[PDB]
Design a protein around this ligand. Structure first.
Ligand code: CLA
Ligand code: CLA
Ligand code: CLA
Ligand code: CLA
Ligand code: CLA
Ligand code: CLA
Ligand code: CLA
Ligand SMILES: CC1=C(C#C/C(C)=C/C=C/C(C)=C/C=C/C=C(C)/C=C/C=C(C)/C=C/[C@@]23O[C@]2(C)C[C@@H](O)CC3(C)C)C(C)(C)C[C@H](O)C1
Ligand SMILES: CC1=C(/C=C/C(C)=C/C=C/C(C)=C/C=C/C=C(C)/C=C/C=C(C)/C=C/C2=C(C)CCCC2(C)C)C(C)(C)CCC1
Ligand SMILES: CC1=C(/C=C/C(C)=C/C=C/C(C)=C/C=C/C=C(C)/C=C/C=C(C)/C=C/C2=C(C)CCCC2(C)C)C(C)(C)CCC1
Ligand SMILES: CC1=C(/C=C/C(C)=C/C=C/C(C)=C\C=C\C=C(C)\C=C\C=C(C)\C=C\C2=C(C)CCCC2(C)C)C(C)(C)CCC1
Ligand code: SF4
Ligand code: SF4
Lengths: 37, 80, 189, 62, 166
């Protein structure tokens, strides 16, 4: 590892990671507090 | 026939002339640019309208311009 | 100096003309080939087949009734080139002649002659041939290739402005003119 | 007058891709026969994919 | 309070019909399994959640239609006067806060990298420290918005905006 973090900084990796976290957060909220209308 | 016109923004790079597949354009001498040549279109009865010249031109809004017009058997690219 | 060349001087070489007619003929109808094979024994079958030398990409009836095109050049060696009408042919050492049905096919072969051979061939001449027998020389029209500037050439269809300085169509209505052809220097037909 | 080599100009030629945009001057030609003497370079390429163009003095704001 | 011809879900018979219809389906599925088995437990969890959900909708002042399904009120005046602001009006404010935040973070990062040597390299390779800093400093985004607006630093002037031949 000397340029591996720069690879992780590229747009599709950062996108996959960000969506995964944002999705995970919404899933976990919809586990704890379901059926908000 | 199509009509090919050259405007005074030409810089005489010869790229349009090189691009043309039916020998319509040539370079003639001129004093309006550093290269001392402008493009010209003597043989527009042989122009097929491909617009390859306009793709080659590097000036901002092209100095060569092809206005499509009436069709002939030459302009329609027919081998029959 | 440079003078306008003649196709007649090129067409004197009867072998090169024979070859040109051979290659610019259409492939035969199945009926005709059947008859040709019918008149020979079996050993001579490839010779019959070897007698055809054309393709389906060659001249049709328009060439006879409207105009055909001829390209001539001289090669330093016998080499295989690619026809613009599909397939391959052999240029001979010495004079080559080839008939085509469009000017774009001629110049396509010309473009191949000037790029795809190690001694580059620069000496091709293209002519237009009418049915009556008039031959008009086309290219290179003044001896110099058109990408090179040559004295004696004049400006054709030059507009002495930029393209943004053209008029509006609504300003030349019912007058018989367009904005693009106003004040054009060297306006050809 | 001409702009200085290295100065910044604003294009005022309406048919240009870089109208109302700023470019760097690279070269000025001094002959009077030349119709578009100033060479300008821009950061944003146009649709053709080029980044440079010749201009006249009456098409620049410097 | 019944408005617009709607009944409250808490005192609607069609609401109960719907709950019955869902619970009955789950019972039918349970008939196939054995009362201790793990599929059975799954179907019980499903049924529990279902009854809980209907109970929640009942004590929320939701308003049912003739279909027996809850209906939302979107005029803010009607919503606030009859206690339905949680259906659309609060979510509005909630969406507009988060959308303003995302915009502000994005605009900020773009204005920051635009002063770099090759600004386009910082668009395909994200400057992750810079991006995290911007993401967390942008929680008070109306500060920046109202400042930019009132000062005049929000809009580019028309003379600097590329435009066509008009
Ligand atoms: C090997 C597989 C692979 C795949 C599938 C992709 C796919 C993509 N790359 Mg590429 N890329 C790759 C290899 C790959 N790349 C490599 C080896 C390099 C050299 C490092 C690049 C360099 C590169 C650059 C520089 C860029 C891309 C971009 C892109 C995106 C194109 C625009 C787009 O679709 O954005 C729309 C975005 C999406 C559709 C988001 C998808 C993200 C994940 C997959 C979804 C996860 C969300 C959730 C958990 C599940 C889905 C549910 C949801 C849809 C509701 C696309 C994600 C461009 C981009 O803009 O990406 C942001 C971009 O700038 N890539
Ligand atoms: C585009 C318009 C649209 C809108 C307005 C909605 C709205 C809703 N959907 Mg629907 N949905 C949509 C498209 C949409 N969806 C699409 C395309 C699909 C198919 C993939 C779905 C599939 C779907 C399902 C399967 C479910 C929803 C649910 C919901 C409710 C979300 C409850 C929630 O998680 O909030 C809580 C989330 C937050 C409060 C966000 C927190 C963000 C931060 C932490 C807060 C910061 C504030 C300061 C909400 C009414 C759920 C629901 O229960 O509805 C009754 C539900 O189960 N949606
Ligand atoms: C409407 C149908 C039709 C038309 C308009 C043409 C027209 C043409 N054919 Mg084609 N041809 C056809 C059907 C047709 N053909 C069929 C069905 C076959 C058999 C597959 C052929 C085999 C064929 C050959 C080998 C050649 C041509 C050639 C030509 C061209 C010159 C004239 C000729 O020599 O005919 C030639 C011969 C025929 C038309 C055969 C007639 C078929 C008879 C009536 C039997 C059909 C039924 C039979 C059970 C099928 C046997 C299949 C078996 C061989 C596997 C001309 C463009 C020539 C060409 O391409 O010049 C470059 C050429 O060399 N044709
Ligand atoms: C976008 C279009 C729009 C339309 C057609 C309506 C229509 C209405 N509004 Mg609503 N309203 C709106 C947007 C709108 N509103 C907005 C943007 C606000 C500010 C957030 C309000 C705040 C509002 C209040 C405070 C009141 C209404 C009320 C009403 C009712 C007016 C009755 C009357 O005139 O006496 C009518 C249903 C009145 C009502 O009857 O609500 C109970 C009322 O008191 N509206
Ligand atoms: C900084 C990011 C940003 C900001 C502040 C804006 C702001 C705006 N957009 Mg634009 N847009 C953006 C990115 C952005 N956009 C991107 C990435 C795309 C390509 C998909 C577009 C495509 C687009 C279109 C086609 C249109 C707009 C329009 C608009 C205007 C009205 C609101 C809207 O339509 O939202 C809609 C926004 C989208 C459809 C794109 C989603 C933007 C994402 C969710 C946020 C930015 C993502 C970015 C990667 C964040 C990285 C930040 C991080 C590194 C710190 C508003 C000025 C409209 C307009 O012109 O109004 C007059 C319009 O038609 N936008
Ligand atoms: C799909 C629904 C959705 C939801 C509910 C969220 C919710 C959120 N986003 Mg996310 N985001 C989303 C899609 C979503 N995002 C999309 C499509 C993009 C474009 C790529 C982003 C890009 C984005 C950025 C740039 C930021 C957020 C941030 C946030 C948070 C701001 C609230 C806070 O106080 O912290 C919130 C949790 C902000 C945050 O605080 O993260 C630190 C923030 O800066 N989002
Ligand atoms: C509803 C419209 C409105 C708008 C556009 C503003 C706008 C502003 N307020 Mg004001 N304010 C308002 C209503 C509003 N206020 C109301 C109803 C009160 C209660 C009396 C205040 C009390 C108030 C305080 C105490 C402060 C501001 C400050 C400000 C500035 C910073 C805002 C911020 O960072 O967001 C926050 C998320 C900005 C000029 C701040 C300021 O001036 O800082 C220099 C500040 O400290 N406002
Ligand atoms: C998402 C997001 C944001 C964020 C965020 C952040 C930082 C959130 C943090 C997330 C975090 C911190 C995620 C938790 C991990 C825990 C897991 C997965 C479970 C543990 C794993 C399990 C199940 C362990 C179980 C066991 O030990 C048991 C019981 C017995 C052992 O014999 C065996 C094992 C080991 C199996 C912003 C910044 C707020 C806004 C942005 O817009 C979007
Ligand atoms: C190769 C590559 C790539 C690719 C990628 C991809 C394609 C991906 C995908 C991805 C994906 C596809 C993702 C996914 C996600 C998911 C998620 C996000 C999930 C979550 C979940 C959860 C959170 C859950 C939980 C739960 C529940 C709910 C219940 C119970 C159990 C549990 C707890 C588990 C990229 C582009 C980077 C580029 C470079 C290379
Ligand atoms: C959950 C929830 C919430 C929240 C939410 C949010 C906050 C969201 C966000 C979201 C987001 C943030 C999203 C985004 C998205 C985006 C997209 C999806 C986009 C797309 C785009 C497109 C598609 C485009 C296209 C185009 C172009 C680019 C150009 C040309 C034209 C066109 C148009 C084609 C609330 C609070 C309300 C409440 C509760 C529930
Ligand atoms: C409230 C409400 C309502 C209504 C409303 C209305 C009626 C309104 C209107 C309105 C109008 C009639 C208008 C408006 C206008 C607007 C504008 C004009 C805007 C602007 C914006 C901007 C400018 C921007 C922004 C931004 C961005 C993009 C980025 C980030 C930052 C900022 C924020 C700056 C309803 C019922 C629906 C629902 C409930 C709520
Ligand atoms: S349109 Fe094609 S044939 Fe006509 S001048 Fe341009 S390049 Fe030559
Ligand atoms: S018209 Fe364009 S391509 Fe042709 S010589 Fe002039 S500048 Fe070069």
């Amino acid at each position: 590892m000397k340029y591996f973090t720069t690879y992780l900084s590229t747009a599709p990796v950062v996108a996959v990671l960000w969506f995964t976290l944002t999705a995970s957060l919404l899933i976990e909220i919809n586990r704890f507090f379901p059926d908000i209308l | 026939s199509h009509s090919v016109k050259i405007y005074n923004t030409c810089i005489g790079c010869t790229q349009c002339v090189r691009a043309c597949p039916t020998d319509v354009l040539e370079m003639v001498p001129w004093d309006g640019c550093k290269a001392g040549q402008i493009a010209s279109s003597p043989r527009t009865e042989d122009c097929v309208g491909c617009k390859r010249c306009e793709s080659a031109c590097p000036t901002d809004f092209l100095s060569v311009r092809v206005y499509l017009g009436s069709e002939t058997s030459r302009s329609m690219g027919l081998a029959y | 100096a440079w003078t306008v060349p003649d196709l007649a001087d090129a067409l004197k070489n009867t072998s090169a003309v024979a070859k040109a007619k051979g290659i610019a003929t259409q492939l035969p109808t199945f009926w005709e080939l059947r008859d040709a094979l019918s008149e020979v024994p079996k050993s001579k079958f490839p010779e019959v087949f070897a007698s055809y030398k054309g393709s389906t990409g060659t001249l049709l009836s328009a060439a006879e009734k409207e105009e055909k095109y001829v390209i001539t050049w001289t090669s330093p060696k016998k080499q295989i080139f690619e026809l613009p009408t599909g397939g391959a042919a052999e240029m001979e050492e010495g004079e080559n002649i080839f008939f085509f049905a469009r000017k774009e096919q001629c110049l396509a072969l010309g473009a191949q002659l000037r790029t795809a051979f190690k001694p580059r061939i620069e000496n091709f001449q293209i002519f237009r041939v009418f049915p009556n027998g008039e031959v008009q020389y086309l290219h290179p029209k003044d001896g110099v290739f058109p990408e090179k500037v040559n004295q004696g050439r004049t400006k054709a269809n030059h507009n002495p402005r930029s393209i943004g300085e053209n008029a509006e169509p609504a300003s030349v209505k019912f007058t018989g003119t367009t904005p693009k052809d106003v004040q054009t220097e060297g306006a050809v037909a | 007058a001409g702009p200085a080599r290295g100065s910044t100009v604003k294009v005022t030629r309406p048919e240009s891709y870089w109208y109302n945009q700023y470019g760097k001057v690279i070269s000025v030609d001094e002959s009077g026969a030349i119709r578009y003497p100033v060479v300008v370079r821009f950061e944003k390429e146009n649709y053709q994919g080029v980044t440079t163009n010749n201009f006249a003095l009456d098409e620049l704001e410097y | 309070e019944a408005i617009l011809g709607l009944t409250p879900c808490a005192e609607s018979a069609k609401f109960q019909k719907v709950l019955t219809k869902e619970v009955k389906a789950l019972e039918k599925r349970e008939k196939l399994y054995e009362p201790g088995s793990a599929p059975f437990q799954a179907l019980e969890a499903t049924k529990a959640k279902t009854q809980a959900r209907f109970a929640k909708y009942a004590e929320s002042g939701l308003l049912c239609g003739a279909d027996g399904l809850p209906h939302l009120i979107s005029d803010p005046g009607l919503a606030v006067k009859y206690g339905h602001a949680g259906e659309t009006l609060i979510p509005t404010i909630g969406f507009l806060y988060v959308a303003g935040y995302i915009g502000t973070a994005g605009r900020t990062y773009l204005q920051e990298i635009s002063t770099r040597q090759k600004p386009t390299q910082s668009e395909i390779i994200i400057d992750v420290p810079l991006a995290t800093s911007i993401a967390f400093k942008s929680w008070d985004w109306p500060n920046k918005a109202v400042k930019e607006l009132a000062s005049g630093t929000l809009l580019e002037d028309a003379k600097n905006v590329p435009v066509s031949r008009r």
